[PDB]
Nucleic acid binder design. Structure first.
Ligand SMILES: [Cl-]
Ligand SMILES: [Cl-]
Ligand SMILES: [Cl-]
Ligand SMILES: [Cl-]
Ligand SMILES: [Cl-]
Ligand SMILES: [Cl-]
Ligand SMILES: [Cl-]
Lengths: 417, 417
RNA sequence: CAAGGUCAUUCGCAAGAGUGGCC
RNA sequence: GGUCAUUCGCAAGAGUGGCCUUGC
């Protein structure tokens, strides 16, 4: 009855089983656990780490970087995250990891089915999707996932439950039916997550959810560990979160024309001058560069060429920074040269004089333009010093439905394949 | 009382804690388990895999690649391996891995000290060395190693034991002393390894070893798991192995002048012709090349230049191979051109026309010369295509006390550092 | 003094390419 | 055909190193 010990392998089973808008992400709450950079930063045990290998799962998605460490400290979570941010692994990994570590508990040890974990989904296509990922992370484990949803044969689902159910995925209406039929009890449900809670509300599932969570045998908030996921955060969702969550963490996650052009290092100042000379009366331009001395040298160059500009970087005093922000937003010096210091308001044009080394700085940078309904332009200079970001920038431009330079996908092929 | 679960970390403790002759290696026995290429191919659990990370052990030494899989399948082992082959990790990792997996057993649960594992060493230099390696692999575990040796204060060792001892490292004379004093009992010793058994015999420790292993409470062979390590294998060691081991696996692991020279690809045939033209009357030369058609094209070249040579590679029939070995061994065609097919007798000169991609194939190749008391010569041609083996070949030449080309250690610096 | 990113190398993992060897 | 091993490109993890960027 050790649940941290992996079962004997099975290769037949093995082969059967085996976006960018969400990168500005902030979690706020009491003693919020800091976000991780890799699945290695949390110790989720042999089975979980094993099955992570088998999925070929590489790095944690932005939501996974913040959700996973929150879940592992058994803190409730209200997460506003969209379809495609890696929500499923974000809660399935730490929950199962804890289930392996603790085992089934003396109630189910000295023993209808009692799932230790209940995942509620609005639709059949998402319930099955969550279920399929649960089997991949429960492979070679004694934890058996099940899935239960309306619109299909209830007789076959009943037959699957009786083969054992410790993690249950379900749609609200079909789960209510299984408890009236006395096939499921929630008396030992220590983990409850609600996926796409907004859609679950939109589809009219609140009475079933309140019946599942409040009018029956499920342990209350503070005892059970609760997670809510929803793409939008209207007040209806906030009131359900205050009803269902306890001392929780709030986690929150392209009207911009993006142009990438090839510019050799010795041509960058000339290319910049041409972009500035085509800039309107009082449009503000944000010029991002790599190094503090780069920002210093470039502001002097622009001054000697007759452009009213200013500068800001990490070694600037808070006073020097305020002076630059004054001249910039008064329009007197409408060009601001900055390092990463100014990646994290109403800027019309962001120029990546130097592209950054990682795709996340690129997101933060272009996020200073094209704000709240305005039109924004982001122009980036690219050469051989930037192949380290070829593949991630190409993937981003494709997702953003931006024009992709034909030579850029050619260099992604030639370097990565 | 779960021993697979890691303890809370400890920062202070962490930084407190954190050859090439041995690579022709063969294990023979009944259903001998196959050798591994990485520590990952055997599942030694969270704690072990953890602490391997923390020591930064990257790959298994040749002895480890064969010993570890043998130990994990609970097979006795007689290993002829020298100090410096990674013996300690070879038995410490799988033994501790199993102890974590099984725990202490229901005997020690309901409870002088009873070590589950006893390591016997000839000297305190090796006892302390093994003990320090055991602490690195038992960090954050509930398994406590101890070390006990003559020549030091027995009073301090006694008080270390009663803080708990599950893995005991000891010298024979000081151990028997502890069991006469009733401080150590062997009634639960399921793992026994004897390190440098030859030296232990040389130093006169057989009566103590026979008293420890045969005349007291240690479980007999076939019940306990026994491993013997010794640098030499005289018949005295073999008789001790037949008394102490049960259905065991036998594991067995610089009179060659080695020259490395820079040869561009278009110059190799010219360089080879000069080596052949300086070859004695009835000396046999082995010329190793990379590809089968490389071997074909080179035997044709040597033929059209008037050299009696022959060839062998993987796509040659057993008949074609015997014909080539006939002309080679008779002296009629004293040059044999071969791929790796002939790396694994009385060869005077081995020429690595093409250096191999891995350092293991290199030694197997040079092992065909300088055998049975004969000064052998090994000539290797090197260029840009062989930088992948720069550091392994440089390290090997240094250990072999061979002359190192000054340009070779310079290219190791510029590529790896 | 803390964080993070990139680059070199070492190392385990997958996909891919090339080559070698075994039946 | 089927198995195995090595190397190289890339993806991702850990350490060393170098470089750079931030916070105080
Ligand atoms: Cl439903
Ligand atoms: Cl339950
Ligand atoms: Cl200031
Ligand atoms: Cl050793
Ligand atoms: Cl002694
Ligand atoms: Cl014992
Ligand atoms: Cl034949």
């Amino acid at each position: 009855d050790d649940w941290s010990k992996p079962l004997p392998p099975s290769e037949r089973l093995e082969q059967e089983l085996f976006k960018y808008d969400d990168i500005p992400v902030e979690a706020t709450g009491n003693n919020c656990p800091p976000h991780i950079e890799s699945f290695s930063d949390v110790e989720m045990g042999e089975i979980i780490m094993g099955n992570i290998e088998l999925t070929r799962y590489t790095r944690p998605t932005p939501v996974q970087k913040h959700a996973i460490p929150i879940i592992k400290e058994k803190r409730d979570l209200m997460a506003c995250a969209q379809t495609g941010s890696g929500k499923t692994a974000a809660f399935l990994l730490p929950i199962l990891s804890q289930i392996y570590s603790d085992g089934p508990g003396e109630a189910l040890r000295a023993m209808k089915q009692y799932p230790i974990s209940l995942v509620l989904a609005p639709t059949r296509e998402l319930a099955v999707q969550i279920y399929e990922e649960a089997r991949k992370f429960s492979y070679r484990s004694r934890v058996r996932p099940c899935v239960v949803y309306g619109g299909a044969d209830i007789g076959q689902q009943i037959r699957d439950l009786e083969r054992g159910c410790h993690l249950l995925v379900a749609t609200p209406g079909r789960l209510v039916d299984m408890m009236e039929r006395g096939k499921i009890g929630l008396d030992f449900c220590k983990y409850l997550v609600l996926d796409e809670a907004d859609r679950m509300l939109d589809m009219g599932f609140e009475p079933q959810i309140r019946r599942i969570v409040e009018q029956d045998t499920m342990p209350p908030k503070g005892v059970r560990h609760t997670m809510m996921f929803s793409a939008t955060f209207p007040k209806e969702i906030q009131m359900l979160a205050r009803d269902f969550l306890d001392e929780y963490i709030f986690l929150a996650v392209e009207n911009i024309t993006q142009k990438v052009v090839w510019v050799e290092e010795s041509d960058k100042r000339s290319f910049l001058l041409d972009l500035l000379n085509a800039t309107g009366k009082d449009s503000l331009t944000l010029v991002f560069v790599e190094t503090k001395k780069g920002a210093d040298s470039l502001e002097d160059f622009l001054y000697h060429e007759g452009y009213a500009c200013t500068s800001i970087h990490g070694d600037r005093s808070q006073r020097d920074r305020e002076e630059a922000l004054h001249q910039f937003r008064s329009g007197k010096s409408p060009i601001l040269v900055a390092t990463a210091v100014a990646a994290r308001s109403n800027v019309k044009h962001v120029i990546n004089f130097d592209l950054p080394s990682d795709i996340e700085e690129y997101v933060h940078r272009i996020g200073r333009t094209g704000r709240v309904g305005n039109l924004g332009l982001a122009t980036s200079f690219f050469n051989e010093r930037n192949i380290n970001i070829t593949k991630d920038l190409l993937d981003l431009l494709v997702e953003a439905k931006q024009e992709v330079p034909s030579w850029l996908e050619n260099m992604a092929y030639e370097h990565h394949y």
